[PDB]
Design goal:
Elements (H helix, E strand, L loop, with lengths): L3 E2 H12 L4 H12 L32 E3 L11 E9 L2 E8 L7 H11 L3 E4 L4 E2 L2 E2 L10 E4 L2 E10 L3 E10 L4 E8 L11 H13 L8 E4 L5 H19 L1 E2 L1 H8 L10 H16 L1
Parallel strand pairs: 4-12, 5-11, 5-12
Antiparallel strand pairs: 1-13, 2-3, 3-4, 6-7, 8-9, 9-10, 10-11
Helix pairs in contact: 4-7, 5-7
The protein binds vanadate ion.
């Protein structure tokens, strides 16, 4: 669609900041309303047998783009996980955006990873933030843990200033696959990171870890919409910039909003997307 050249984008940024960022605020208000004339169904999300599988009652997975698990013999809603396919730059279903797993969905989570042939997990939340539970620990602290038919083994860990990388082997007892978890650990309990550069490095390193041809990269935070959407837009726009030297943040964001509710949840995040791209463009 309407992509603009990097040079123009770079002037456009200053205009968005100018009058108190009234521009950014108007853009994001446009994103918020972009699906207002779109009734998108989420029937499986709202089904009673599935209610315990949602971390947040108001954060749903749209039906048309939801990831389906293969049905289990025995129930009629065992295909459900709160997770949607999301497009990336020049590729459909480049990501799976999902909530932070609950103990009750650990098996579903890892089965989904197995079935989708996912090789990369991007986690952008701490387990607990400001005293509040945000995600349950769905991986082994050391050695191995069993989640249904999938056994996960921690092979190694590197802990950087702002993010942690865990290498796992996972095996379906019906260890067969490598899964790399990139875990950003310095998102503040309030608001957005103060400097984009660390996030930028995180995105580049985690995006580069993507092998041809694995399944979608799984990206989650707590709800799987705010930091998750921000990661997705930043990663996708860096792709487009590298590829065509153009950028379409607003267009892309309005597009993926049809694929999962609330992606890029706050105006601060919408602005932080631009801080990050500008640093990548200048640096
Ligand atoms: O955990 V998020 O609120 O960034 O969706």
């Amino acid at each position: 669609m309407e992509a603009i050249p990097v040079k123009q984008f770079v002037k456009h940024i200053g205009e968005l900041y100018s009058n108190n960022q009234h521009g950014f605020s108007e853009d994001f208000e446009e994103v918020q309303r972009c699906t207002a004339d779109m009734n998108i169904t989420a029937e499986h999300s709202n089904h009673p047998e599935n209610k315990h599988k949602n971390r947040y009652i108001n954060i749903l997975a749209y039906d048309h783009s939801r990831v389906k698990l293969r049905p289990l013999p025995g129930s009629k809603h065992s295909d459900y996980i709160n997770a949607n396919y999301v497009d990336g730059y020049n590729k459909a279903k480049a990501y799976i955006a999902t909530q932070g797993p609950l103990k009750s969905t650990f098996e579903d989570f890892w089965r989904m990873i197995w079935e989708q042939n996912t090789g990369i997990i991007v986690m952008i939340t701490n387990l607990v933030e400001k005293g509040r539970r945000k995600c349950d620990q769905y991986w082994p602290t050391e050695n191995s843990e069993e989640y249904g038919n999938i056994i996960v083994t921690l092979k190694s860990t590197k802990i950087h200033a702002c993010y942690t990388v865990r290498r796992f082997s996972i095996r379906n007892t019906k260890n067969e696959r490598v899964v790399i978890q990139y875990h950003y650990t310095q998102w503040p309990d309030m608001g957005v990171p103060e400097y984009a550069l660390p996030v930028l490095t995180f995105v580049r390193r985690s995006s580069a870890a993507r092998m041809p041809e694995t399944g979608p990269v799984l990206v989650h935070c707590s709800a799987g919409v705010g930091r998750t959407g921000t990661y997705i837009v930043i990663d996708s726009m860096l792709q487009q910039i590298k590829d065509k030297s153009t950028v379409n943040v607003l267009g892309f964001l309005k597009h993926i909003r049809t694929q999962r509710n609330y992606l890029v949840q706050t105006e601060e995040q919408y602005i932080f997307i631009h801080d990050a791209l500008l640093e990548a463009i200048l640096g």
